[PDB]
Amino acid sequence: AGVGKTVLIMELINNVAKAHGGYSVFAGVGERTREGNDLYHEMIESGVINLKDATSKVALVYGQMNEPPGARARVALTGLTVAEYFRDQEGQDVLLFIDNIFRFTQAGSEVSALLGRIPSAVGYQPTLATDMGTMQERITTTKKGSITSVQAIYVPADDLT
Amino acid sequence: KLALKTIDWVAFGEIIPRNQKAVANSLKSWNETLTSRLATLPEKPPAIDWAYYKANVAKAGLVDDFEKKFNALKVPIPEDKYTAQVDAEEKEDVKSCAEFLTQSKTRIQEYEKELEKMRNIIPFDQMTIEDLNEVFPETKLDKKKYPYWPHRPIET
Amino acid sequence: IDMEKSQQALVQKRHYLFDVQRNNIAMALEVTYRERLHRVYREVKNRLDYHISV
Amino acid sequence: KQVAGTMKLELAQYREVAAFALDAATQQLLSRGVRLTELLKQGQYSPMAIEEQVAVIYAGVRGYLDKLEPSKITKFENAFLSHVISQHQALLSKIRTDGKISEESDAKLKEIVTNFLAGF
Amino acid sequence: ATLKDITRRLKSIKNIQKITKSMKMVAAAKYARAERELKPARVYGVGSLALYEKADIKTPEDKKKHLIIGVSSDRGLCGAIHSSVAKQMKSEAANLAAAGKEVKIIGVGDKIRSILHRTHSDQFLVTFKEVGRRPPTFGDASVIALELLNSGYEFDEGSIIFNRFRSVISYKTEEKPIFSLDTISSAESMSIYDDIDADVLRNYQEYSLANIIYYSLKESTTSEQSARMTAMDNASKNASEMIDKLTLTFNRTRQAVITKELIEIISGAAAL
Amino acid sequence: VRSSAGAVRDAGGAFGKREQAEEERYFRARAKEQLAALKKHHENEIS
Ligand SMILES: Nc1ncnc2c1ncn2[C@@H]1O[C@H](COP(=O)(O)OP(=O)(O)O)[C@@H](O)[C@H]1O
Ligand SMILES: [Mg+2]
Numbered sequence: 001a002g003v004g005k006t007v008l009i010m011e012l013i014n015n016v017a018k019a020h021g022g023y024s025v026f027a028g029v030g031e032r033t034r035e036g037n038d039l040y041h042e043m044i045e046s047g048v049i050n051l052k053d054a055t056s057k058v059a060l061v062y063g064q065m066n067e068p069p070g071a072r073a074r075v076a077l078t079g080l081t082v083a084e085y086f087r088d089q090e091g092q093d094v095l096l097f098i099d100n101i102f103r104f105t106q107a108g109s110e111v112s113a114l115l116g117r118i119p120s121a122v123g124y125q126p127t128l129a130t131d132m133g134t135m136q137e138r139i140t141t142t143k144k145g146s147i148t149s150v151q152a153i154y155v156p157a158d159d160l161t
Numbered sequence: 162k163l164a165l166k167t168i169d170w171v172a173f174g175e176i177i178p179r180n181q182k183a184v185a186n187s188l189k190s191w192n193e194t195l196t197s198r199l200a201t202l203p204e205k206p207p208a209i210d211w212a213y214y215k216a217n218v219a220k221a222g223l224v225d226d227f228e229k230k231f232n233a234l235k236v237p238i239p240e241d242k243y244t245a246q247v248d249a250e251e252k253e254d255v256k257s258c259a260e261f262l263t264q265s266k267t268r269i270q271e272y273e274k275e276l277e278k279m280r281n282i283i284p285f286d287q288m289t290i291e292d293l294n295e296v297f298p299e300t301k302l303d304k305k306k307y308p309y310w311p312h313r314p315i316e317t
Numbered sequence: 318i319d320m321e322k323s324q325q326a327l328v329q330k331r332h333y334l335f336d337v338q339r340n341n342i343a344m345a346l347e348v349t350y351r352e353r354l355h356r357v358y359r360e361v362k363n364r365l366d367y368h369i370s371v
Numbered sequence: 372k373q374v375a376g377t378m379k380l381e382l383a384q385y386r387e388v389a390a391f392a393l394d395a396a397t398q399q400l401l402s403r404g405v406r407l408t409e410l411l412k413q414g415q416y417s418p419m420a421i422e423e424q425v426a427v428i429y430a431g432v433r434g435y436l437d438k439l440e441p442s443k444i445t446k447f448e449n450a451f452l453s454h455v456i457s458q459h460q461a462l463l464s465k466i467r468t469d470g471k472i473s474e475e476s477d478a479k480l481k482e483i484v485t486n487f488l489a490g491f
Numbered sequence: 492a493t494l495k496d497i498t499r500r501l502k503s504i505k506n507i508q509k510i511t512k513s514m515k516m517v518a519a520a521k522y523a524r525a526e527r528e529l530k531p532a533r534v535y536g537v538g539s540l541a542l543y544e545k546a547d548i549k550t551p552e553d554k555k556k557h558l559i560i561g562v563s564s565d566r567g568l569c570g571a572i573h574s575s576v577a578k579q580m581k582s583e584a585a586n587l588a589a590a591g592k593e594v595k596i597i598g599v600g601d602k603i604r605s606i607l608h609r610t611h612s613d614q615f616l617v618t619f620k621e622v623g624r625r626p627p628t629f630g631d632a633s634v635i636a637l638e639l640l641n642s643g644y645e646f647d648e649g650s651i652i653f654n655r656f657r658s659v660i661s662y663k664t665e666e667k668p669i670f671s672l673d674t675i676s677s678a679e680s681m682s683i684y685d686d687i688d689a690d691v692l693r694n695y696q697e698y699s700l701a702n703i704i705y706y707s708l709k710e711s712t713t714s715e716q717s718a719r720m721t722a723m724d725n726a727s728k729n730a731s732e733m734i735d736k737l738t739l740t741f742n743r744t745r746q747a748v749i750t751k752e753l754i755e756i757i758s759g760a761a762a763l
Numbered sequence: 764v765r766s767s768a769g770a771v772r773d774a775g776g777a778f779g780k781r782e783q784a785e786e787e788r789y790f791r792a793r794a795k796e797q798l799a800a801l802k803k804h805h806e807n808e809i810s
Contacts, residue, residue, distance in 0.1 A: 118759060119759045165340045167458075171489040188334075192340070195345050202352070206351075206354045206355050214365060231361060244342050253331060261324075262325065265324060269321050276318070499774040502767060503766075505765075741764065
């Protein structure tokens with residue numbers, strides 16, 4: 001926390017997304033709502049989000065950290081679905097920014113104990129790897145389209161292990 | 162009530178003889194503490210809500226008596242007896258304006274006298290040894306102690 | 318000559334030490350007076366607060 | 372914003388070379404860092420008005436306190452506050468109302484600090 | 492602390508111990524070389540001092556100009572080498588100034604300058620750095636003597652303080668007097684020496700100054716290398732004791748963490 | 764349990780800060796020297 005994940009991802013949106021022909025998607029998963037509003041207004045100012053015409057180049061999905069775990073565990077899938085559609089039917093390049101994709105895991109962990117599952121190594125659900133794989137495996141560049149996925153991943157207490 | 166004459170401090174510190182700095186610094190510090198205290202105290206004593214208060218007491222007569230005694234009775238105020246240092250000011254006028262000024266000005270007068278005397282002298286290419294003896298009494302060769310030629314101690 | 322001129326210049330402003338002393342004495346008396354005022358005020362309010370608390 | 376920025380840079384540089392305690396440049400860098408450090412100390416239940424904080428930090432960061440010892444900085448801070456709160460209430464009101472250190476305000480601040488430093 | 496704090500501390504101390512062992516080995520090699528080079532310089536310097544102790548020269552008791560030279564190095568981590576020398580220098584300088592003299596100081600090595608830069612900061616005639624990087628040579632002593640003579644502080648008496656190397660484990664701080672030719676000329680023991688005007692004697696004094704400085708350099712470097720070897724050995728030993736204690740603590744903490752996580756899992760499993 | 768390179772400054776204990784300062788002071792000195800040389804070269808190359 002406090003190292004530059006959000007600033008770096010905003011910088012990437014500033015560079016790549018602004019000068020990118022294809023569409024773009026931003027799924028804010030379990031992050032501060034202040035930042036969601038700041039991004040909305042910065043995008044409106046830059047022009048990627050146009051409130052007047054139909055020339056907007058970014059679709060936003062928000063599941064911020066005031067939501068109950070059920071919504072945080074699924075807003076990533078909602079953003080991923082929007083990106084998947086733009087990949088397949090539109091048959092075009094897509095960007096997909098997620099911030100953070102650790103809140104998906106964490107939100108999955110906040111309900112596992114109440115669903116009757118014994119916990120795993122460190123208070124995590126037994127299905128951590130499978131639950132994360134069944135999501136990260138739809139964010140891919142198939143032969144029908146191409147998703148460039150940038151993910152911010154919180155590392156609790158700087159512990160990379 | 163209060164209007165304190167302003168001060169310059171770097172100026173103030175120029176006027177303390179070395180034998181008197183030990184009291185000057187203490188006076189500075191005491192001024193500092195007192196000024197901080199005065200700033201601490203408020204501009205006015207806060208008011209009193211006599212009506213409400215006497216409305217919230219049983220023996221309204223007793224509180225009325227205290228209120229009236231407060232109104233009639235006032236507080237004293239100190240005097241300038243501790244300001245006897247008034248006297249000192251006049252004494253200073255003597256050194257500053259009468260004594261030190263006067264002898265200082267006379268010493269000036271003499272220093273001028275000497276300066277214009279030393280500035281109006283013939284070009285040295287025209288002068289004579291008697292002239293050096295008189296303008297500079299340092300070039301005189303005392304015969305009272307070296308009567309014989311050269312009147313110098315040759316080891317010189 | 319210049320040394321004497323500077324000394325004379327300082328003579329003019331010699332009076333600041335007395336000025337400081339006067340300011341100090343006056344404002345010290347003022348401080349004591351204000352302390353007396355506030356002390357009577359505080360004691361009387363505590364005095365009467367006794368009765369209301371009772 | 373104007374003053375705390377330079378203060379932030381000065382403390383950031385100071386914290387790097389702090390673990391020890393030669394040359395004039397780095398010696399003065401440590402001196403300035405320490406002066407600012409003792410400037411930031413404070414008591415309890417005595418918060419300061421923003422303009423007063425600006426005055427103190429400006430005095431400290433503009434090389435004025437670099438002459439003083441670092442054990443006396445608290446004495447300065449306190450006395451300077453007491454002096455300004457009475458003699459120069461107008462300047463503090465100006466800084467609060469206009470919300471910036473204008474050029475005239477900066478020149479005043481400069482002369483007040485220069486006078487007070489020597490007179491202390 | 493927590494397990495990560497202990498792990499980081501343990502790794503750091505292990506690195507420190509490795510480094511100190513390597514430095515002890517390096518210092519030991521340099522010490523062996525320094526002793527080897529010190530034997531001949533020992534005979535040479537003792538010979539150069541021969542004259543003054545054979546023709547007993549008493550310094551005049553009517554002169555105020557004195558010189559203090561203190562030989563050390565730039566390198567640290569040598570224990571109480573620079574400390575002893577600086578302590579004795581300030582002792583002697585205080586004594587001289589209490590006797591009403593006009594002392595100066597030459598510092599051969601930074602650490603001497605630093606130790607004496609708070610007090611005696613103004614008596615530094617000149618100081619020399621870059622000592623200790625390579626073994627001192629006669630070139631260094633010649634340069635020091637040359638810059639002492641060139642800098643026109645004609646001294647009336649002298650002293651040099653260096654750490655005489657006794658043994659691989661011990662050293663002593665000495666004070667070898669230095670005389671100016673004013674004292675050699677007016678010494679009755681010197682009336683026996685033949686073919687001696689006041690010019691050959693001046694060249695002889697300059698050479699003897701270079702000789703004594705070189706002797707002190709060799710003794711000081713030998714003692715310093717010995718002290719650095721000893722200091723590094725002791726530091727490595729202390730790091731080893733600290734590593735043992737921290738390894739015990741780390742093992743306790745690792746087991747405690749395993750037990751804590753396992754009990755959390757068990758409680759969660761049984762609390763369904 | 765092993766040790767790795769650059770661990771003294773990873774712990775951040777006393778040795779870490781001591782090393783950081785021992786580096787920073789030296790390189791501030793060298794930067795000052797190099798800046799002086801750069802100014803001298805600037806002046807000497809105007810003509
Ligand atoms: N490029 C940058 N330049 C300067 N400061 C930065 C930069 N990126 C981040 N920061 C600092 O990090 C803070 C923001 O961190 P942020 O990236 O929002 O947190 P996180 O990465 O934990 O989401 C800011 O207050 C700022 O001081
Ligand atoms: Mg963030």
